[PDB]
Amino acid sequence: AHFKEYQVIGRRLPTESVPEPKLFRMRIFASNEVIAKSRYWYFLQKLHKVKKASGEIVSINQINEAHPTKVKNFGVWVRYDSRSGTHNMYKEIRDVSRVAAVETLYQDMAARHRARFRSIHILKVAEIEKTADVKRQYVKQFLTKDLKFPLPHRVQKSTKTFSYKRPSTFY
Amino acid sequence: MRVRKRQSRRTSTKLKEGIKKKASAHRKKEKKMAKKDVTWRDPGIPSNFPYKAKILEEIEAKKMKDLEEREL
Amino acid sequence: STDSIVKASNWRLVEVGRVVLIKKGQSAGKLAAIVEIIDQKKVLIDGPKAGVPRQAINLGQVVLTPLTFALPRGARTATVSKKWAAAAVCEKWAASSWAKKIAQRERRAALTDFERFQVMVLRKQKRYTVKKALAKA
Amino acid sequence: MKYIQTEQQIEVPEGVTVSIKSRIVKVVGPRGTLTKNLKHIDVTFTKVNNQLIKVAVHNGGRKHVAALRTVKSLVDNMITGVTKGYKYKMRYVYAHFPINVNIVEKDGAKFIEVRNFLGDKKIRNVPVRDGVTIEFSTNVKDEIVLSGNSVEDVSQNAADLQQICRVRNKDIRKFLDGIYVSHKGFITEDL
Amino acid sequence: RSKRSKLVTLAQTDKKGRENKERIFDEVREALDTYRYVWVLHLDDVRTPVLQEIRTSWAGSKLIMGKRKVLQKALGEKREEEYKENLYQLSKLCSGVTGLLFTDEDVNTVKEYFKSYVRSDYSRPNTKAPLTFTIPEGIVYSRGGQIPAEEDVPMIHSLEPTMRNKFEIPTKIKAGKITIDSPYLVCTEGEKLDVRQALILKQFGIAASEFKVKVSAYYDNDSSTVESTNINME
Amino acid sequence: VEPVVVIDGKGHLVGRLASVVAKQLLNGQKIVVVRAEELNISGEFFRNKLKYHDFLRKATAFNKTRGPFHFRAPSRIFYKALRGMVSHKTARGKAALERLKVFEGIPPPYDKKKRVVVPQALRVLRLKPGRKYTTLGKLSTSVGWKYEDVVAKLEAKRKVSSAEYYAKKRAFTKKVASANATAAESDVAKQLAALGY
RNA sequence: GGCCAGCAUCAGUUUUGGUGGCAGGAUAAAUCCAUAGGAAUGUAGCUUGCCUCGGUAAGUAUUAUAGCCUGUG
RNA sequence: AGAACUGGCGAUGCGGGAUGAACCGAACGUAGAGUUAAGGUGCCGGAAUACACGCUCAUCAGACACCACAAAAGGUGUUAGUUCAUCUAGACAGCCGGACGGUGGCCAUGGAAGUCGGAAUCCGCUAAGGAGUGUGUAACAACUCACCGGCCGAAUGAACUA
RNA sequence: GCAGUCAAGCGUUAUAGCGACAUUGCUUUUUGAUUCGAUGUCGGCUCUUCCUAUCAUACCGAAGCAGAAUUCGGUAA
RNA sequence: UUUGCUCCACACAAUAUAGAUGGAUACGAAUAAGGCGUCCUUGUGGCGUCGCUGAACCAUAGCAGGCUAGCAACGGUGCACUUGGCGGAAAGGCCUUGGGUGCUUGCUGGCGAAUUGCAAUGUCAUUUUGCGUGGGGAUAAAUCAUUUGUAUACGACUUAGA
Ligand SMILES: [Mg+2]
Ligand SMILES: [Mg+2]
Ligand SMILES: [Mg+2]
Ligand SMILES: [Mg+2]
Ligand SMILES: [Mg+2]
């Protein structure tokens, strides 16, 4: 669906002589909190030796974009599950929000790489402060000063089956 | 300009069901060969990631901290 | 007359300061300004005078208007409001035949039945005068 | 990729007027006029000054920008054609049977008539395309000159003349008779 | 896909990297301290036997070639990056195919040698014609009429396609010999030469033009001044 | 909204036009299609010609006169496209097909009638620019239709007459618009403007 | 009183709208305001080259005759 | 192919998969109303020629069974990745110039000079230049390219993956 | 076909194990010399059509293809 | 085959079935371009203006549209005539002259409507192989049977005969 970002903080169950186990936080992109918690347990078991049965979720909070009406460039570092192994991929996405950039990235992985949400891992989404660190041409072409472009061949949606006039594509 | 015969793409029931049996046999054979065979069993930071230096500095500081975390 | 001549084909341009009219969604029929370009298919718009919130919108949801005004790139909502008022975008829009067609459509949709009767009577009177003028000339 | 905007420049000299409308290019120069239909290609022409014309593609791909460079080359060839002309010199050679090349008029249609190619009784007739002039070289043996404004017309006429005299069923290591393009160039040689 | 495919050759020599530029840079900056006079020489279109003869005649000195930007960076491009005081003037005086002569001899002796050194050379394009040459009528010979045809040997037939296409000379093969129907004038004296005419003259072996080193200026180590020489700069 | 809808087939795409016309006929609308020779099929001319030669391959082996009947005219090509989208072996399907007429050119009486377009089937609105397309007249001529030149000459004559008619109508439009302008300053016109007319 | 219907007020099931009062979260994040810094896809101004009566190319210049970004409240 | 356990079908209609023993839904008194499953919504055909981000043009695309043809092979189609390298003391492409000296290195041949062959393949001067990458000559010549420089001026090349 | 050799890849930190392309041995040796068990269905005549995996006819490309003739290949029923 | 046949008007008569219920309301071409208006030195010209849907334009008030009085104007509109021109793609229609005869809601007045009972399509639009009135126009063929043989199984074909 449309993505939200959550911080999920969990821990092992306290035992005898071991109070206050270490708290682990993870940033998860998901459609809702049930999916977010599921992905968190998946990664915690994949990385450490912690199971959902032996642990608990301490906190889960939605994280909002700080400046959702500011256009930013994002470097996205991902890796996808494969027979040859984990494969790094770096992409650049221009958008106003991290969740919008991640939604674009998932749609793009489905379109080009034929990849699914369960197969894609997000390693890091970072905002590029300076425009000189942008290094993909399909993003750098939109960083030109006084950028103006037209939209040739305008196709207007018709509400009726028949039109009494030949259409125009002018804009 | 003589046009030849084109192969039909209409599905055949017998072929479809036979391919189903073929695929099940193939998967079972592959699983058996996987349980039988004797063949021995971290790409890191991408070169185009801009904050490579920050990632490396953080991993080095983490290593230095973890070196003394377990000792004391 | 020995100079080359090439036809121009003036296109309305996607650029900062371009006035757009929104055609579908929560703010349909309202004017906003393009504040920044995201990509070929999406821009950022702000509509502070009309009540359009600052938002990223798809270009398939607005129509570019011929109007444009001076605007810094990425300018915040209050600055957009100030520059919009200074450029007097609303008046230049209201003077257009596009805006008049919109308002005429709304008034015709808002007429009552008694008013439609009045309209027919007036049309008949105007028709009588126009035909009489058309006979002499 | 889908580049946002890709453009090329076309330089217009002083004696040349270019009129472009709905992708029909007319170039008028000291040697005459040429016309081209470019309506099979989506481009936009813009006038920057009297000496410069831009041709541009918006939101194009690889095939589109390849067409853009093709368009620029074609219009430049028109400008060269109306300002300097095009001139192809051909030579016809033979071993034993002399080749007879003349200009003949069949109802005022202006054919090049080629006779006695390897002793053939067949008369080969190559029509002259419109706008192409045929001259026979003075004080040069067995040379034809094809001249005109349209390089496409001149080079296609030269190709027709070269292909009408193919050697058939014979070893071409041995049999060398034919008509061959010997030089491609311009008409005017002010410098 | 659809890109130009580079040709692959199996030869015995590899390319030079940045290390050779650094090596020549080091040699320049060492010779600046070692020798006293640094002369800037222009040596465009010079032949290697001539250059090696020059190096031999200046035994005990140093002649250094290389990339002009490398030489200028070694001498110092600007005032704050120069290797020695007021060397940037000599550095910016370099142009074209540049050689540096590090020496210890007298200014008069270096000037006299470079004023008196001259050798016969092929005529380059965009140069004045030193003579008016014409291939004589009939069978084309190797020298093309400079020596008598009885001494001269006829031109080999393998050069006929080169003469016909590249030089645009009307030639025909008769009995394995290259023949022209009429005399062919190649160049008239005092006329600017293009690539085609220069190639024709080089093919026939006519060397009437003169070669001479150009001397721009020199820099003195202890005096720390540059003096414009203006030798053969006409 | 008309009893009879006259559709100008020029510049339309065959399948999308056939789909809309089939649905309109089944809902009970009378449709006349004119200028079937200027219709378009997406794809390059050799592709569409190859498809027609595949159709020409099809025939009943023991008696060719029983087989699929290969009509070469552009109107019949469009009719085949449409009949494939109508359930034509039922009485309802036949009754629907009998609400349609298809013509090459614009014969009388339709030449003095209004002709409309279908925007969801128009080539300049549907095809991405640069994609190749075929024209039905050339396709029909290559596969055996023999009346392209006759229809072209008749279309030229009709265009001359229609152009003269439009010149007269335009002059009258100018006169009526002029005389209507000078009544815009009266109280009646002000009241009409207040009401929206 | 036999046949077929219309409207109103209800009951059972259900479908489709308008509108109000509340509660949570970073007690939304934003916008907006104030303040402290900062940079360019460098605003005004100033220098120079030589340019269609000043419109430009390249340096300085951080708010100025535009503005933007970050933290804090 | 031999064992063991568990389902489905025969005795069983209904919706869908165009059609159908084992496929996807769902099991059945007679009706009405509402809502769905699986599958679908250009037209045949009830239901958006809906909205959104990308990819693809096939001289018989694809809308299929995830088995085979299939060598993860071939391709100067096109898109996105990854890892290496070169680069304003000058990227790639082009044009021009240099491309030398001992030396026609030794043996061999009627001839054989880098370039029919067999073995060595060195030394000097360099900015660089093979006892020579090919064209060429009866042998030389000439051309070439390996390599270097001048002009030009900002990105480029190679191998892999999807 | 069997047995081997090489090594682009696959594989991996344990030079184990797979493995395309190439390649060797046997079959099969040097001077162009000098019929061996189908165990169960086959063929005519008349007449039509289809495939192309083309023998001829048409047009092309390559070859020491002089010419003549031939060989190999492409489109083509 | 007891005046058969066909049209031109005035009465009665019946009728209007893949679906009337204000009007199918005519440039052409382009779409990386056009429409309209205006001006010039008439062109690939200058200037202006339009689109972003027909949500239009034209019609549209009166017992399903009655009866009457005026005012303003020389218009609009129906019918039957008549003047001329054009249309062959299946023209069967488009334009036009003149007078006559009705209406006109362009504006101001005076009478009428009811009871179909609170809705029930509440019946409204061309052509008419029918008849009675009539003034005008035109008075044929084909087949069987007989016959020929250019034909032929039979039919059919092709000939001939007041
Ligand atoms: Mg209720
Ligand atoms: Mg439907
Ligand atoms: Mg097979
Ligand atoms: Mg074949
Ligand atoms: Mg009344």
mmCIF file of C-alpha atoms (C1' of nucleotides) in Angstrom, chain D residues 1-3 60-68, chain E residues 1-3, chain H residues 77-79:
data_model
loop_
_atom_site.group_PDB
_atom_site.id
_atom_site.type_symbol
_atom_site.label_atom_id
_atom_site.label_comp_id
_atom_site.label_asym_id
_atom_site.label_seq_id
_atom_site.Cartn_x
_atom_site.Cartn_y
_atom_site.Cartn_z
ATOM 1 C CA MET D 1 17.199 7.521 -20.345
ATOM 2 C CA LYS D 2 14.524 9.978 -21.498
ATOM 3 C CA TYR D 3 16.709 13.061 -21.670
ATOM 4 C CA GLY D 60 13.292 11.857 -26.275
ATOM 5 C CA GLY D 61 15.066 8.525 -26.367
ATOM 6 C CA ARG D 62 17.979 7.044 -28.292
ATOM 7 C CA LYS D 63 16.110 6.555 -31.575
ATOM 8 C CA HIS D 64 14.621 10.053 -31.340
ATOM 9 C CA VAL D 65 17.994 11.784 -30.858
ATOM 10 C CA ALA D 66 19.519 9.707 -33.664
ATOM 11 C CA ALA D 67 16.761 11.127 -35.855
ATOM 12 C CA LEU D 68 17.662 14.601 -34.556
ATOM 13 C CA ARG E 1 23.947 -2.602 -26.965
ATOM 14 C CA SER E 2 24.745 -0.985 -30.333
ATOM 15 C CA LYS E 3 28.119 0.562 -29.648
ATOM 16 C "C1'" G H 77 17.882 -4.084 -29.594
ATOM 17 C "C1'" U H 78 16.563 -1.317 -25.273
ATOM 18 C "C1'" U H 79 16.465 -0.270 -19.721
#
